[PDB]
Structures are given as structure tokens and as C-alpha cells.
């Protein structure tokens, strides 16, 4: 399961993120036309990067019951909502009554990952339709 999240980071946050999740050679742009360049994981060039400049960066997070999650939110069957930090989904003591689990994305956004005993990719989300076969009936025509 791969979750893609787009975020907006200032220069300091962008540098920290890029060095934390290794980037070899690529250029990041900002709103005001300012850009920064990483080449072999080194900040070669910056072009007039004022403060309050937001660099938009997409981030890929692998979600798995064994792998711990930074910050997620769980909802039981009755209605109680709770939040957990740094705990794998399988680690929860009470998964019997856990109905939903979202991932809090540091932007206060919410991404569903766990729905009714399964990861969101495994769940199939059945639609609705009345049960019936083909009509296969000849009708009179009005012409």
C-alpha cells in the first residue's frame, strides 16, 4: 500500500526533508519563481529564496500493518475516536472493535487506510443493485 501526499515546505523544511529522504539530483521550484538545486545530494544553487516561500513536494509513504505509523486516528464501532503516535496498526490492543483508521497527515488532512478489518486496498466497496437477470422480453412498439 502506497499513500501519496502533497505538502508545502519552506526552505529549511525542504532541505531537511530532501536530506532525510535522499535525493540525488533534481531542482525544486517555489511560488515566487525561486528555486533550489540538489546535485549529488548537495545544494549547488539557490535563486533568491525569500522567506514564506512554499515549495510543493510530493511524498510517498508505505503503509503496512507491521510498519509503524507516525500519527494515525482510530474510530471504534460505538463512535469513540482516539489518536495514536508511533504505533503499528497490528500493535493496537483492541482491534476487535476498531472500525476505521485514518492517517493524520501533519496538514490536519485525513487519509483512510483501514476499513472494517482490512487495509483500504483489500476492501472492495460493494455497490448496490437490485438482484435480477436479463429481461429478455419482447415489448410492443409505439411507432
Amino acid at each position: 500500500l502506497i499513500i501519496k501526499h502533497q505538502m508545502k515546505l519552506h526552505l529549511n523544511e525542504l532541505v531537511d526533508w530532501a536530506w532525510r529522504n535522499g535525493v540525488t539530483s533534481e531542482k525544486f521550484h517555489s511560488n515566487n519563481g525561486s528555486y533550489v538545486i540538489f546535485d549529488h545530494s548537495a545544494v549547488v544553487e539557490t535563486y533568491i529564496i525569500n522567506k514564506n516561500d512554499l515549495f510543493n513536494v510530493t511524498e510517498e509513504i508505505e503503509i503496512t500493518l507491521d510498519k509503524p505509523i507516525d500519527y494515525f486516528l482510530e474510530k471504534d464501532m460505538y463512535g469513540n475516536y482516539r489518536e495514536h503516535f508511533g504505533i503499528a496498526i497490528n500493535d493496537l490492543l483492541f482491534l476487535n472493535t476498531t472500525v476505521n483508521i485514518w492517517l493524520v497527515n501533519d496538514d490536519n488532512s485525513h487519509i483512510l487506510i483501514y476499513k472494517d478489518g482490512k487495509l483500504i486496498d483489500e476492501y472492495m466497496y460493494h455497490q448496490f443493485e437490485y438482484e435480477a437477470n436479463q429481461n429478455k422480453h419482447i415489448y410492443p412498439n409505439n411507432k
Binding site: 460505538y78 469513540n80 482516539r82 483492541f94
Partner: protein, 55 residues
């Protein structure tokens, strides 16, 4: 190692209604003296305007 969790929801709705009435009567002699000529005052206005005044 023992864990736990709790949850409660108590919701109360109330209604009140009070209807209080009273009636106080005070008796004073000063009111009886002012009572005397309330009826007679009606016909002093009738006599002044509507009727003749010379024998």
C-alpha cells in the same frame, strides 16, 4: 500488562414552567370618602350644558 479504555455520554434535557398569580385588596377609609361623589359627578356635566338654568 493490563490496558483499558472507557467512554461515556450523558445527555439531559429539561423543561420548567411556573404560573404564579395573586390578588391583594387593601381597605382604607380614604377610599370611601373619595367614593361618595363619583356617581353624582356624572349629572353635574349633564345639568351644566343640556338643561335650562333660570327658574
Amino acid at each position: 500488562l493490563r490496558n483499558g479504555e472507557s467512554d461515556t455520554k450523558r445527555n439531559t434535557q429539561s423543561q420548567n414552567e411556573m404560573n404564579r398569580t395573586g390578588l391583594t385588596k387593601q381597605y382604607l377609609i380614604d377610599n370611601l370618602q373619595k367614593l361618595y361623589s363619583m356617581r353624582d359627578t356624572i349629572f353635574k356635566t349633564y345639568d351644566k350644558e343640556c338643561f335650562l338654568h333660570i327658574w
